[PDB]
Amino acid sequence: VEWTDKERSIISDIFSHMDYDDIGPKALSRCLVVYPWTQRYFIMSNANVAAHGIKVLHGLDRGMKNMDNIADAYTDLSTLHSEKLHVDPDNFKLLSDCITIVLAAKMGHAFTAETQGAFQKFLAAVVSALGK
Amino acid sequence: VEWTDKERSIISDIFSHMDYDDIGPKALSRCLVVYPWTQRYFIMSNANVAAHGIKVLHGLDRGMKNMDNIADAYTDLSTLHSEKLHVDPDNFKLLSDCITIVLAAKMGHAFTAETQGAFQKFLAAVVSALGK
Amino acid sequence: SLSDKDKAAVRALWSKIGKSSDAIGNDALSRMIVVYPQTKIYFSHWPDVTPGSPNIKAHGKKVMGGIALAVSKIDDLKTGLMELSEQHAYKLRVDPSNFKILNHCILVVISTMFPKEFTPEAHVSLDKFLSGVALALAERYR
Amino acid sequence: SLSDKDKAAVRALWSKIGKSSDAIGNDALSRMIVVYPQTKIYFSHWPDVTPGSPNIKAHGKKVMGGIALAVSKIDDLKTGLMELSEQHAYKLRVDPSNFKILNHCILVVISTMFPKEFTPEAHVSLDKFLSGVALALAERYR
Ligand code: HEM
């Protein structure tokens, strides 16, 4: 989509100061607790949940590296979660919100509205690519 | 997006047997009654509502004629409703459902599931272009 | 929440269309399956999940039976549909986002069969009613 | 619907964060305005609709005042927020789809300020609570 140099910098900055082993597990754990119906696909101490939590951020990393091709970068995963895993699409938005809330807790006041905006646009783009 | 020859034929068939002066007014009227908060932008007998109802179908007509460029065909309207009219985007989906329900009542049993599918995909594409 | 005007409208409409409930259920499930393919996974254990199949016709009766139950328990949907909520949340594990989908297909079907009776006034009340049904079914999810 | 466990969680959390309600309101409105630009139109009559502006700081107090009211009327949000629903539906004519937006910004703000207290358990209860608040505010729309 249309990215600004500022958005590219913010997203790049967020990812370079994000500890995937910390954020991934926390975001997925929170999602399974806040929206319990997503527990079916698999809470805080479960290594399997932690593992997939890390994989999610690593999956985002891929889109952060090639922000211009976000749509085509997720074809393999869109099909996996859809055809094989049968994850209802609405759940991508639920996880996205949890990732945002977890990142907000880590960044504190550094997670400005502008930072939130760029990040939400980034996740919206990834979510669409996943439901594609 | 990806249209099949069958989808093109169905959508073409629907539009060629659709009376805009009948469907337009009925769909908009229903929307203002079912989701009253959309009344603010402007019920059955109001000529102004009828007029815009007709315009909506004529706007769909444009996308039906060039189904491959649905996204770029609505730039002028996306901006009008957004920047000038300030129509909340969620309302495009509400109208779309009303158009579907009104068409279903007119077509009766001819409005098969397959017909509904093609039509909903068509409207989903237009709605996205409008919120673009 | 449903007003007395809403409850009267739903009872009056149900009084008129209830006779064709088997047909409405079959048609509504058929459409959901065809138009919204992700829902298919929930009925994968059936051999025939194609429109008008014997499994779908049968289930359409059970679904409309739940709607008739909701109409009779209209004054308190939360208590009335508690068992169905528990069933969908725990036993079936149906993602709650799907309730709004079926509701839409039900409205389409009713519209195709009773165009004269499914007026916009019957529509707002039925739509509020179905939202309450969906909300009641979501009760036991968290 | 909120359980007793949910009500206790919301009261306990509110007990802890309530002191910073002015700051939470200002921050939550600021974010909504910046992240979701379509909401700006509702506050167009204010001269300064930029983050931390005097108008937004002021309103943030009023919004959090509504949340505090909701917490105190937690046992019946429909009756408790009836006047606010009527106000948003009729006087303000705020599109009901926006309630879910502000709720999300409130959660973000609380998370940035009270990371230690905003646990996932406090989150599910607060999320259910805010959905009930949004549902209550939507009461008078139709
Ligand atoms: C929104 C971002 C998402 C991304 C980027 C993502 C990414 C991934 C990746 C990288 C894998 C590993 C696939 C492989 O083995 O090659 C995976 C697997 C899987 N995902 Fe996700 N996922 C997402 C959302 C979801 C959601 C919402 C659920 C539902 C709670 C979910 C459930 C699963 C499950 C159960 C597996 C298979 C078992 C496993 O290997 O962990 N994912 N996902």
Ligand code: HEM
């Ligand atoms: C989903 C399809 C939509 C299409 C294709 C559509 C199309 C149009 C068109 C062709 C016009 C005339 C613009 C001109 O004068 O050049 C218009 C105007 C307008 N639209 Fe829509 N519209 C849509 C949705 C909406 C929605 C959801 C609302 C809100 C209820 C709305 C409210 C208005 C208003 C108030 C005007 C300006 C006054 C008028 O000329 O009627 N429209 N629309």
Ligand code: HEM
């Ligand atoms: C909004 C209206 C809904 C109502 C009133 C409803 C009602 C029912 C009822 C009465 C049963 C039969 C239970 C029994 O025989 O003990 C049932 C079963 C079931 N429902 Fe629903 N349901 C609703 C929505 C959904 C949705 C949207 C889905 C999934 C996309 C769903 C999936 C199922 C499944 C998979 C079963 C079991 C099917 C079988 O194995 O025969 N239901 N439902």
Ligand code: HEM
């Ligand atoms: C979900 C929480 C919400 C609560 C608790 C809430 C609460 C309030 C309260 C207490 C007032 C002050 C009324 C008075 O002073 O008499 C108010 C005013 C108002 N609200 Fe909300 N509101 C909510 C959501 C929203 C949303 C999402 C919007 C719009 C995007 C909105 C737009 C307004 C506007 C435009 C005013 C009047 C502003 C002014 O002229 O000063 N409210 N709200």
